[PDB]
């Protein structure tokens, strides 16, 4: 039970990489396949069954590129790679897998989709106005913002959960300069 079926996707907007990013919040996505004969649906293979049931539980019914997605357990056992239009993607041993490290289930901010995002790996002389503008530019409005004591991390509250999902998809691993890539997670905290 490692393969999720995700339907009612936005056929025109969704990519494998956006599905990687979003489902990678809850597990390590091994492979994605958008279906050729039903491009609003896709198969997603997690590393294991706990990851699959977690992703299903938290993402089913959430709004992604404007549409309410449905996430169920697939009838498939694995997601087969092809011998094209890039509907398939292999993400084996991705450097972007959050749950590489032993015990990581507790240190990746595993929470339901939340209007407040948790930012980490921020480099110095990234200002607040800089992060507000970057997040606002994903099409949302930034309601609140708070640095933690070192400015390596921050909370940032978009107007809605929908807008936070969009931002997370867009800006996780964003290059903020120096050699710092931003990490965006959900949060149960509030500013
Ligand atoms: Cl299918
Ligand atoms: Zn099938
Ligand atoms: Zn640093």
Here the tokens at position 17 are 């990489």
Pick the CATH number of 112-191 from 2.60.40.10, 2.130.10.10, 3.30.70.330, 3.30.930.10: 3.30.70.330
| Residue whose pair of structure tokens reads 């990687």 in the numeric block | 20
DSSP 10-69: -TTT--HHHHHHHHTTTS-EEEEEEETTEEEEEEEEESSHHHHHHHHHHHTT-EETTEE-
Helix (H) / strand (E) element for 164: namely helix 161-171
The Å distance, Cα 30 to ligand 3 centre, comes to 28
Residue 123 CA to ligand 3 centre (angstroms): 5
- Give residue limits of the domains in the chain: 1-77, 112-191
Q: Contact at 8 Å (CB) between 148 and 138?
A: no
What SS3 state is found at 120?
Answer: strand
Residue with tokens 């997601």, as numbered in its chain: 79
Task: Tell me the CA–centroid distance for residue 180 and ligand 3, in Å.
Answer: 7
State the fold for domain 1-77: Alpha-Beta Plaits (3.30.70)
Dist CA 125 CA 27 (whole Å): 32
Determine how β-strand 88-90 pairs with β-strand 142-147: unpaired
Q: Which ligand is nearest to the CA of 41?
A: 1
Q: What is the whole-number distance in angstroms between the Cα of residue 76 and the centre of ligand 2? A: 6
Ligand closest to 42 (CA) is 1
d(CA 82, ligand 1 centre) in Å: 15
- The rounded Å distance from CA 88 to ligand 1 centre is 13
Nearest ligand to residue 153 Cα: 3
Q: Do 127 and 133 contact (CB within 8 A), yes or no?
A: no
Q: Which of 150, 151, 145 is nearest to 117 (CA)?
A: 145
Beta strand segments in 97-140, E: 116-120
Residue 181 alpha carbon to ligand 3 centre in Å: 9
Output the CA 5–ligand 2 centroid distance in Å: 9
User: How many angstroms separate the alpha carbon of residue 50 from the centre of ligand 2?
Assistant: 21
């Amino acid at each position: 039970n490692t393969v999720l079926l995700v339907s009612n996707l936005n056929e025109e907007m969704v990519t494998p990489q956006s599905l990687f990013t979003l489902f990678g919040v809850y597990g390590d996505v091994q492979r994605v396949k958008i279906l050729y004969n039903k491009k609003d649906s896709a198969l997603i293979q997690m590393a294991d069954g706990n990851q699959s049931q977690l992703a299903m539980n938290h993402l089913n019914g959430q709004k992604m590129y404007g549409k309410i997605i449905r996430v169920t357990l697939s009838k498939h056992q694995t997601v087969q790679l092809p011998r094209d239009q890039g509907l398939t993607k292999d993400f084996g041993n991705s450097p972007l897998h959050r749950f590489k490290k032993p015990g990581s289930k507790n240190f990746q901010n595993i929470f339901p989709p939340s209007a407040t995002l948790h930012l980490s790996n921020i480099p110095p002389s990234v200002a607040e106005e800089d992060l507000r503008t970057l997040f606002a530019n994903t099409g949302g409005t930034v309601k609140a913002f708070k640095f933690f004591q070192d400015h390596k991390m921050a909370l940032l509250q978009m107007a809605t959960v929908e807008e936070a999902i969009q931002a997370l998809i867009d800006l996780h691993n964003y290059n903020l300069g120096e050699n710092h890539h931003l990490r965006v997670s959900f949060s149960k905290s509030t500013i």
